Design a binder for this molecule. Structure first.
Ligand SMILES: *[C@@H]1O[C@H](CO)[C@@H](O[C@@H]2O[C@H](CO)[C@@H](O[C@@H]3O[C@H](CO[C@H]4O[C@H](CO)[C@@H](O)[C@H](O)[C@@H]4O)[C@@H](O)[C@H](O)[C@@H]3O)[C@H](O)[C@H]2NC(C)=O)[C@H](O)[C@H]1NC(C)=O
Ligand SMILES: *[C@@H]1O[C@H](CO)[C@@H](O[C@@H]2O[C@H](CO)[C@@H](O[C@@H]3O[C@H](CO)[C@@H](O)[C@H](O)[C@@H]3O)[C@H](O)[C@H]2NC(C)=O)[C@H](O)[C@H]1NC(C)=O
Ligand SMILES: *[C@@H]1O[C@H](CO)[C@@H](O)[C@H](O)[C@H]1NC(C)=O
Ligand SMILES: *[C@@H]1O[C@H](CO)[C@@H](O)[C@H](O)[C@H]1NC(C)=O
Ligand code: NA
Ligand code: NA
Lengths: 383, 392
């Protein structure tokens, strides 16, 4: 058995939408990671002889957590052996009323401002900022659609609206975000429009941060654009410098700015992020009164992908065989091996094959996994 | 006979309104009586600035009340220091942070909070960061004008409503009825003394749980840090929502390991819903805390790094010593407080390249006689101690 079509880790769908997922498996000829293959629940799903496992659209009192939120798997088997797919996490989510808000921001004139689209934490996984717009409907910008980093206004990849060098005119404007539910097509304007409240500098203020926390963390994807916020106010208007700690030490290096890594006012943007961009960053903000610093721990995740070589061999008893698991991704918390669908007793890319009997023949699988996703590779040993 | 020593050091921090002005004392003794010199942030000695800065014969530094137009950063926002010297030597006081604040209006706001039914909710009083260290929450007020948090200096933790020591309004076990209410916070400026209600009113927007939801925190950040002072009541928020309603357990990491111990709740250490309150904090309460939140569907965890400060203080052992030429002299800097970022040394007002608590002069020469000082500093604060070396 082998699949060139395998289900995705995350399956998310509405109560109205429903979903389909197919596992194709090939060879010359579902289950649960809870260990069992269970049949069909009436009207909450079905298996068809066409291999699709289908969750139909359902009224939400018919929501059952043990069906609708669970890990599923796909087992393909034949004469010679069997193999398991990667973990498939099904999440059904009932279409529900939600609102987003833009709260006011309070800034000292001359400083950069950051407007935020406030979204309920419990819908925040399926609801993302599309655009920001004026009182009269004119756009400050549309997220993710092309760019520029030098403008008065910038809609950050993370969805916040960034405003360079605030001035009285900026306080005459209202700011309203448009948001999109990614399970449905639904777009909605925020229930409220935010305003900038600008304080005229009188005396001098050392840099102050929006909160008292000196550390935060954030997660990011490879090939995407990651934003590190540094939110600081001061008069005279401070300058911001970003640094990155050498992994494993307490010392630092200036972040090198170029056409990839960009600084907008105080904010750092890492474009086309790579796993190597992970680390602890230090934002340092200074003016003639004083200075302050804040740390951000960045993790850049990479998709888990695994393939085994040598994939297909012929070995009799007394001789060697070998399988190395070749895998890419970030992070990697665990590495597990599985023989014909049965988890074995050692975790390592290097496994020990010495004296074979044909009890040891089947199809072999190498599993790579982290908190979010898993990746699987299937090999074969013929005798 | 004797080198200078401070009878009264100026305090670490002087914050004052332009309408108040301020006075700062520096009094040092000695035989002969010492001369007093004040110095500013850049190290230069300072005299009178008519209308703005004055020093009297007793060494007192005075800032008269002044008009906003007359504000000067090189005068009014500064780290000063008192220097006392006689023929025997010089000592420098601890840092004196002088900050004048020109009276200026500000707004506080209460934003809405979105919560799943049955979960706890936390309403925050949003105070702009640039006024934030002058402005404290006093009470909360609802739409009918009822006051929350205005009685006692400690609040009962077993009620529906709790105003937390850090100023937020905590509400247990929200239900749809709690959505018909709106609240304002009342803030007080600790210099001007003015109090005002927040310019906006917040309310709980309550979502009726339909399906199941794993725990989700208000922020995607898995780590934050917090400062608090010894003997105060420190609050560690864990703001997470789930359906079914989740359980929350607090842990503390074991210093120098991967592992963690459960937090012990007692009369001093309280848990209100998901929120941990450490009363009468001590330095030992410092560390990395973990909040873990679970329900049927899933679980999540978030870290909080807590530092419990204690005031810095120092003395040198011995306060005085007499040493023959050629012989070793030793000074030991004894200090307390928390945290301690740096220990540094001084001799007669000049900085020495010694970072360690014991300072040993292997063989003393004539020029070694004079005053010695160790300084202990962290980000917020400093302390100093002085000692005298005499020759045999
Ligand atoms: C410390 O700095 C403060 C600056 O904020 C000083 O307070 C200011 O004092 C000046 C006088 O030098 C006042 O200016 C006058 O204002 C009135 C109108 O007053 C009304 O309007 C203002 C707001 O516009 C309001 O603050 C007042 O309460 C009144 O409602 C004019 O008619 C005068 O011609 C003159 O311009 C400021 O009003 C006042 N500001 C504040 C915020 O109180 C304070 O005097 C300084 N302390 C000193 C010098 O010891
Ligand atoms: C499951 O998904 C459906 C969509 O297929 C959700 O639809 C909701 O349906 C209810 C009524 O069936 C709508 O409420 C209102 O009903 C009154 C009459 O009682 C009517 O006058 C209103 O115009 C409105 O139709 C509700 O607006 C609608 N919402 C959405 C987002 O579709 C349904 O809510 C989901 N299940 C649950 C338990 O919510
Ligand atoms: C900026 O402020 C930091 C404090 O966070 C300080 O360590 C640094 O030396 C300051 N830089 C300058 C140039 O003053
Ligand atoms: C609670 O959630 C944490 C977060 O990962 C998890 O490690 C732990 O196993 C969960 N506890 C239970 C009993 O499910
Ligand atoms: Na001191
Ligand atoms: Na002293």
């Amino acid at each position: 058995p082998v699949f060139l079509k395998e289900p995705t880790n995350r399956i998310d769908f509405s109560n109205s939408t429903g979903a389909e997922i197919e596992c194709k498996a090939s060879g010359n000829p579902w289950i649960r990671s809870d260990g069992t293959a269970v049949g069909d629940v009436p009207g909450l799903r079905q298996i068809s002889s066409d291999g699709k496992l289908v969750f139909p659209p359902f009224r939400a009192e018919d929501y059952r957590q043990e069906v609708h939120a669970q890990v599923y798997a796909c087992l393909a088997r034949n004469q010679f052996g069997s193999i398991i797919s990667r973990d498939v996490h099904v999440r059904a989510v009932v279409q529900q009323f939600y609102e987003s808000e833009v709260n006011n921001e309070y800034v000292i004139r001359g400083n950069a401002a950051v407007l935020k689209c406030s979204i309920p934490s419990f819908v925040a996984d399926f609801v993302q900022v599309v655009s920001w717009q004026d009182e009269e409907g004119q756009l400050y910008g549309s997220l993710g659609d092309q760019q520029g980093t030098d403008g008065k206004y910038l809609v950050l990849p993370s969805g916040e609206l960034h405003i360079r060098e605030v001035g009285p005119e900026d306080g005459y404007k209202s700011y309203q975000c448009r948001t999109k539910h990614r399970l449905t097509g639904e777009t909605r304007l925020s229930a409220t429009k935010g305003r900038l409240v600008i304080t005229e500098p009188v005396g001098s203020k050392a840099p102050t941060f929006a909160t008292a926390s000196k550390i935060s963390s954030l997660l990011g994807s490879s090939s995407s654009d990651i934003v590190l916020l540094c939110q600081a106010q001061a008069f005279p208007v401070p300058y911001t410098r970003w640094y990155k700690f050498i992994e494993g030490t307490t010392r630092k290096q200036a972040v090198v700015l170029n056409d990839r890594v960009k600084q907008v006012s105080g904010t750092l943007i890492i474009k086309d992020a790579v796993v190597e961009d992970s680390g602890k960053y230090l934002c340092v903000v200074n003016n003639s009164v004083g200075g302050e610093s804040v740390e951000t721990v960045l993790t850049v995740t990479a998709p888990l992908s695994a393939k085994i070589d040598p994939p297909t061999q012929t070995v009799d008893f007394g001789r060697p065989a070998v399988f190395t698991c070749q895998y890419t991704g970030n992070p990697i918390k665990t590495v597990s091996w599985m023989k014909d669908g049965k988890a074995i007793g050692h975790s390592e890319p290097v496994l020990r094959i010495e004296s074979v009997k044909k009890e040891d023949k089947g199809m072999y699988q190498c599993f790579v996994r982290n908190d979010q996703e898993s990746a699987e590779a299937s090999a074969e040993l013929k005798l």
